[PDB]
Amino acid sequence: EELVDPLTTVREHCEQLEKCVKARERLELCDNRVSSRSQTEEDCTEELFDFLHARDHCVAHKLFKNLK
Amino acid sequence: LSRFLGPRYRELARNWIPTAGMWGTVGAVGLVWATDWRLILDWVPYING
Amino acid sequence: HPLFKIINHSFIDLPAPSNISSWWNFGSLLGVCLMVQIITGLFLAMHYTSDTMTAFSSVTHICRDVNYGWLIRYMHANGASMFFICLFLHVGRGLYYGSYTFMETWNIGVLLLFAVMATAFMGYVLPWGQMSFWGATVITNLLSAIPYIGTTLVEWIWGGFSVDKATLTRFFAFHFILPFIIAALAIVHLLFLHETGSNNPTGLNSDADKIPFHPYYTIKDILGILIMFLILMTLVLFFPDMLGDPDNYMPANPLNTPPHIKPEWYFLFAYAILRSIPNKLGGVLALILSILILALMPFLHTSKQRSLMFRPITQILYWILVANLLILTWIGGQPVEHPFIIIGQLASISYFSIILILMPISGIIEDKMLKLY
Amino acid sequence: LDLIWLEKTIPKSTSTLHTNMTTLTTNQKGLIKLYFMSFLINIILIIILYSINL
Amino acid sequence: DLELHPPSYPWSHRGLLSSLDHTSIRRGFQVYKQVCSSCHSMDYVAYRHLVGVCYTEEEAKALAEEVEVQDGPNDDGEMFMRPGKLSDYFPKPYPNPEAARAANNGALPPDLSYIVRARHGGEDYVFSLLTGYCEPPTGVSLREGLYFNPYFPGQAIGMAPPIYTEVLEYDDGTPATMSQVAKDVATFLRWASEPEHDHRKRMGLKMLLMMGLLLPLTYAMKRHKWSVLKSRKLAYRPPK
Amino acid sequence: LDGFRKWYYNAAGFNKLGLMRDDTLHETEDVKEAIRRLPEDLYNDRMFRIKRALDLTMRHQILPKDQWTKYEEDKFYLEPYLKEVIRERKEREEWAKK
Amino acid sequence: VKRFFESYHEVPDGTQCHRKTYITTALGGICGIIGSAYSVSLNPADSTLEAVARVGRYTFTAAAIGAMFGLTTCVSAQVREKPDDPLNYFIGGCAGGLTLGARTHSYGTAAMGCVYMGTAAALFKIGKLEGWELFPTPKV
Amino acid sequence: EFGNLARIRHVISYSLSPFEQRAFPSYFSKGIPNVLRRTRERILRVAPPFVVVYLIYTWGNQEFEQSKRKNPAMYE
Amino acid sequence: IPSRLYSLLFRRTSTFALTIAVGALFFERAFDQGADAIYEHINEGKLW
Numbered sequence A: 001e002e003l004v005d006p007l008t009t010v011r012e013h014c015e016q017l018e019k020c021v022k023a024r025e026r027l028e029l030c031d032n033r034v035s036s037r038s039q040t041e042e043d044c045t046e047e048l049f050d051f052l053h054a055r056d057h058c059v060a061h062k063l064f065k066n067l068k
Numbered sequence B: 001l002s003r004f005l006g007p008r009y010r011e012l013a014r015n016w017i018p019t020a021g022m023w024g025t026v027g028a029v030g031l032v033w034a035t036d037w038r039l040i041l042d043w044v045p046y047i048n049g
Numbered sequence C: 001h002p003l004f005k006i007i008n009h010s011f012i013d014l015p016a017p018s019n020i021s022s023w024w025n026f027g028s029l030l031g032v033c034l035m036v037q038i039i040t041g042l043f044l045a046m047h048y049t050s051d052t053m054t055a056f057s058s059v060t061h062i063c064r065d066v067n068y069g070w071l072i073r074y075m076h077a078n079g080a081s082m083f084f085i086c087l088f089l090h091v092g093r094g095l096y097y098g099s100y101t102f103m104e105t106w107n108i109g110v111l112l113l114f115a116v117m118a119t120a121f122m123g124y125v126l127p128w129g130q131m132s133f134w135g136a137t138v139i140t141n142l143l144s145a146i147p148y149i150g151t152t153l154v155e156w157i158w159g160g161f162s163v164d165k166a167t168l169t170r171f172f173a174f175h176f177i178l179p180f181i182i183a184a185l186a187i188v189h190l191l192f193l194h195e196t197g198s199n200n201p202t203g204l205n206s207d208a209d210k211i212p213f214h215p216y217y218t219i220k221d222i223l224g225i226l227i228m229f230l231i232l233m234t235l236v237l238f239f240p241d242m243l244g245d246p247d248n249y250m251p252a253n254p255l256n257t258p259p260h261i262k263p264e265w266y267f268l269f270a271y272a273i274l275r276s277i278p279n280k281l282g283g284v285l286a287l288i289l290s291i292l293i294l295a296l297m298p299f300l301h302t303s304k305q306r307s308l309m310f311r312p313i314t315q316i317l318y319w320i321l322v323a324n325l326l327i328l329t330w331i332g333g334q335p336v337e338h339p340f341i342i343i344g345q346l347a348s349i350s351y352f353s354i355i356l357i358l359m360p361i362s363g364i365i366e367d368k369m370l371k372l373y
Numbered sequence D: 001l002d003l004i005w006l007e008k009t010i011p012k013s014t015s016t017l018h019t020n021m022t023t024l025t026t027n028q029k030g031l032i033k034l035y036f037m038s039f040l041i042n043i044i045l046i047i048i049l050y051s052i053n054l
Numbered sequence E: 001d002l003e004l005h006p007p008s009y010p011w012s013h014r015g016l017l018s019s020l021d022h023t024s025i026r027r028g029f030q031v032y033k034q035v036c037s038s039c040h041s042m043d044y045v046a047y048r049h050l051v052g053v054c055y056t057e058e059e060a061k062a063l064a065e066e067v068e069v070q071d072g073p074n075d076d077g078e079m080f081m082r083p084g085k086l087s088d089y090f091p092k093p094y095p096n097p098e099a100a101r102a103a104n105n106g107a108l109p110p111d112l113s114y115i116v117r118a119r120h121g122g123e124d125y126v127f128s129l130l131t132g133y134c135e136p137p138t139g140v141s142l143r144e145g146l147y148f149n150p151y152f153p154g155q156a157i158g159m160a161p162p163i164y165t166e167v168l169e170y171d172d173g174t175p176a177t178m179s180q181v182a183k184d185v186a187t188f189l190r191w192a193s194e195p196e197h198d199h200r201k202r203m204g205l206k207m208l209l210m211m212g213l214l215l216p217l218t219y220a221m222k223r224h225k226w227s228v229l230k231s232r233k234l235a236y237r238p239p240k
Numbered sequence F: 001l002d003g004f005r006k007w008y009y010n011a012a013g014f015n016k017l018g019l020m021r022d023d024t025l026h027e028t029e030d031v032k033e034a035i036r037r038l039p040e041d042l043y044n045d046r047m048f049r050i051k052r053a054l055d056l057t058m059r060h061q062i063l064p065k066d067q068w069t070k071y072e073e074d075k076f077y078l079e080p081y082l083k084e085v086i087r088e089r090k091e092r093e094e095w096a097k098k
Numbered sequence G: 001v002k003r004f005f006e007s008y009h010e011v012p013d014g015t016q017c018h019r020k021t022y023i024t025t026a027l028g029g030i031c032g033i034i035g036s037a038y039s040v041s042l043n044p045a046d047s048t049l050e051a052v053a054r055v056g057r058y059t060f061t062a063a064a065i066g067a068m069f070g071l072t073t074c075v076s077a078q079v080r081e082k083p084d085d086p087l088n089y090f091i092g093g094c095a096g097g098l099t100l101g102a103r104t105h106s107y108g109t110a111a112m113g114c115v116y117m118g119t120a121a122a123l124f125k126i127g128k129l130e131g132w133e134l135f136p137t138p139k140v
Numbered sequence H: 001e002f003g004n005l006a007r008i009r010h011v012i013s014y015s016l017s018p019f020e021q022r023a024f025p026s027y028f029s030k031g032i033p034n035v036l037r038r039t040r041e042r043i044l045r046v047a048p049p050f051v052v053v054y055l056i057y058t059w060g061n062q063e064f065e066q067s068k069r070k071n072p073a074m075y076e
Numbered sequence I: 001i002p003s004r005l006y007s008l009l010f011r012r013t014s015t016f017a018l019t020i021a022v023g024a025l026f027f028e029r030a031f032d033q034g035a036d037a038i039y040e041h042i043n044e045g046k047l048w
């Protein structure tokens, strides 16, 4: 019986919002870009940091109500 | 300073100059000796060593 | 009675101006803060050990095992911060109201300011955290800038090739001994002020309206002491670490440098200036001048009015000076990268040009407007 | 609240706002030069309104 | 530097007059004892501290007598070991820094006694780091013994995910989800870095109350003794 | 320039305390010599005006607008007496210089 | 020289206040010039200088209302964290109303100004949010 | 000390006993107007330097961020 | 009214001190008790 980590359920519920899906779209393009260009040193951290910043901001808005 | 640009003021200084130099000299000797400044002490004819 | 005579002349009946605002409380607060620091420092000294193996352990033992030892330690740290807040507001009162024309009092003041900054620097070195060790090396290195005798002086102070136990122990001794010299210099400070009496915010001769001090400016100092204690205890009991550096809670690792090294909030303005000047020596000098420019201040007064209550252009220049002092405090915090650097360079240029050039020219213009010049 | 505050705010203020606006717009010298120059200003602004929104 | 800045979480120990949840400190101590003690040290925390926090004297001793400690010199002069005592500090997971370095692939697990105080925005950081082992994105590659934790400086922490859901079972039975475990250990580490958090806040309430009484009054006494002057009505009546 | 000087006179704010311009001068040695040479009535009005301004600054009040000091009305009484002090002062200085 | 003003809208509100305030200040100032011009062309002055002064007064006053509007709205948005909220603008519009009031030395005008101007600015925000079209092309 | 501080003449000075007068006469009655009176005589000299400090601080922050932000065109 | 008080415990300085000291002796009891009630209740369920 998988013990649901409320954090996971809150995480995809927060990824359903709009700033997270826009940053994920840049993340995808960014990662595709890095993937497409076989030899390059352009990482996706900035995009990824922006997506994680927005997502964990709205996660930390409402995470602790589900924790005993 | 207006008052200090004066004729007697200048005379006074000229008369005071020698004494001033003497005082700097005393301090100079002291510095050399006290701090053992060796750049200057090393040239001294006798105390060298 | 020859011991009570002093108090009667000085604390009980001294003729004080009737119209001095709450800013004149601040110096008395500084004296109270000094005692508070000394008292808390004494109760830190009964358990602190100035050994590099045991200094961090002794500080943690104070915070964890001594009864209310965390209270005395954080009272000491936030009282140093309160000391610098009251010191900056005292200096700002002296600059705004033309109190620097009491030249001997002003010079004993800037000597006290230098002594307090040195005491706080060595005290911050004392807990032997990561931040203390890298901070010490940094400023001790500042001395190396000296053109010829720099290296020796640095090594002397360090007491060895690099800061190590040799430093910590002598920094404990010097940090212990300097607040008593500060107390003696404060007696000379109040002494040179007793010979003149205080100034008033209008800047005029207040000899026609003076009142006693016991019932009028004593209860006022008691109220200011109570408000300062309220701010100090809400700094200690509610936001204790808000005025600290988290990296000081790690032990001193000579091998690694905490990346976000920065001087405490009060040294920042100076830090900015130092960083601004490209030349190392230049920075050190400018830094010193930053504090010393104040001493130089009584020779720059070119106005026929003592205070800035009736001087609006110099009021505007004064608040621009407070503004870019706050800017220099912010820049120090910011890391080395565009455009923080340029602001720092300008802010320092504007600071020195407002104090050196703009205020006497503005005072000449203000005297011309009143048909005095 | 009745009478003064609810009559000075909604009913009276709107009375004043306009009254004052008519006073400035209708206080005209009657001289032709002034009036005409205003035609000049207009041509200029309209020239621009077209220009910037080209 | 360029680093993800952990968000603000609605903790309970943040309330101006709010104390730490002590059941969470007990659970986080269990988390440290079963997971974090293998590599991290707690040199300035000893069992006695717990007494009066989340454990009783007898219980604490239970805890103490559940570990082994060296005991100075034998009468023979031969160092020996003894049942842990309420006066014993928490055991070293590595006799010397080198040991830890070696075992932890060159990484020195920092003493988690003051980690929360030593890390900027510690409580958050801790939670974030322990719960921030996300996959490295394209363009970044980490060597062995490294992990892409956005929050960790350099996003390359030697520690591996130290909390897998249901890593340990809470004696209280509260579901041991990774998060419930990270929140408990962040509360505990917080407590560790400031065992007096609760006691202090009490004084704070008291101080405010006192100032709230004394401050207003001192003002009335000052305004009494200053009313005299503040009502002075000067007047110049030259001989004329 | 005259209107801008009146605006600066209002912005300086010593007229709101009932002060004159010469009341606001910093008492240096020359200013105290000029004050000592004042007649008794002018000195008494100056001391009363300074005391009233100090009392108003104590209570953080100003005078009513009808009681302020009109720029046009302000009288530069100490000025005449001051010039002399400066003149005499300079003469003496020059003598010593030479 | 128009790609500029538009920029105000492009970046999300509450962000890059510097630009916002600069742009808003210019628009007000531009209006100031135009307004002074009509004010000088008609109801002329007495001396060239007197009129130059007017122009300045009107220009500055208008530039000010421009700035505070820009500053208040941007800051409110940032502080209130509501990137897109009509109220933010209202706070700003009110601010402009007050400024204007001060420059005219009248509390009452500030009252008139706070509500009317603010309401107007708020409506601008709504307008942008709801994609209201002003001066529309004939599409019948 | 007192007695030798200054020379004034014909300046009468009336006063009242502390217990005879209200402690906070019209404290909020005129206090508010006065505090407001005060703020309007000093706000134009004090506030605009701190306003442009706020603008420079924000600007610096933003500018710094943009400085840090990555230019995609850079890599090509 | 206070008058009765004043004439009895607040007019003679010695008595003034007496009332102060005695009051302070009890105030601590009351303050601590009242204050604790407030703090504990705020954090009820978290203590111990």
Ligand SMILES: CCCCCCCCCCCCCCCCCC(=O)OC[C@H](COP(=O)(O)OCCN)OC(=O)CCCCCCCCCCCCCCCCC
Pocket (backbone or CB within 6 Å): C312, C313, C316, C320, C323, C324, C327, C343, C346, C347, C350, F008, F011, H040, H041, H042, H044, H045, H048, H049, H052, H053, H056
């Ligand atoms: C021309 C004035 C017009 C005023 C119109 C307002 C109405 C006036 C009539 C009604 C009365 C209202 C209330 C009056 C209060 C007191 C009087 C007053 O405010 O006067 C105006 C005041 C003083 O005027 P004055 O000093 O003569 O002007 C010289 C300007 N330098 O001047 C001011 O307050 C102006 C202050 C401007 C300050 C600008 C500072 C800009 C630069 C700041 C830099 C800060 C640091 C930047 C970073 C540096 C490092 C990178």
Ligand code: HEC
Pocket (backbone or CB within 6 Å): E031, E032, E035, E036, E037, E038, E039, E040, E104, E107, E108, E109, E110, E115, E119, E126, E129, E130, E152, E153, E156, E157, E158, E159, E160, E162, E163, E185, E186
């Ligand atoms: C119990 C769930 C915990 C918690 C709360 C933390 N850890 Fe560890 N840790 C380990 C090692 C080798 C390191 C150093 C790695 C490196 O420096 O590259 C760490 C580090 C930490 C930190 C400090 C982070 C920082 O910025 O310095 C923190 C806050 C932290 N950990 C929390 C090793 C281990 C373990 C052995 C595999 C396990 C178990 C834990 N850690 C458990 C925990």
Ligand code: HEM
Pocket (backbone or CB within 6 Å): C034, C037, C038, C039, C040, C041, C042, C043, C044, C045, C048, C059, C073, C076, C077, C080, C083, C116, C119, C120, C123, C124, C125, C126, C127, C175, C176, C177, C179, C180
């Ligand atoms: C003679 C009286 C004093 C004594 C005996 C004393 C003693 C001590 C001791 C033992 C410490 C180390 C404990 C600690 O980490 O807090 C310390 C720290 C410190 N002291 Fe003092 N001190 C005295 C006065 C002062 C004064 C006057 C100042 C202010 C200028 C000051 C500023 C500091 C600071 C800033 C620290 C560092 C606090 C920290 O760890 O954050 N001390 N002092």
Ligand code: HEM
Pocket (backbone or CB within 6 Å): C023, C024, C025, C026, C027, C028, C030, C031, C034, C087, C090, C091, C094, C097, C099, C100, C102, C105, C106, C108, C109, C110, C112, C113, C116, C182, C186, C189, C190, C193, C197, C198, C199, C200, C294
């Ligand atoms: C060590 C910290 C200091 C202490 C304890 C201290 C103490 C005091 C005290 C008690 C007073 C008299 C009360 C008052 O007017 O506020 C005073 C006044 C004064 N101090 Fe200081 N002071 C300190 C720092 C300084 C500094 C650094 C300066 C110089 C910038 C300075 C310059 C003055 C001046 C000029 C006055 C006269 C106030 C006036 O009449 O306007 N003080 N100080």
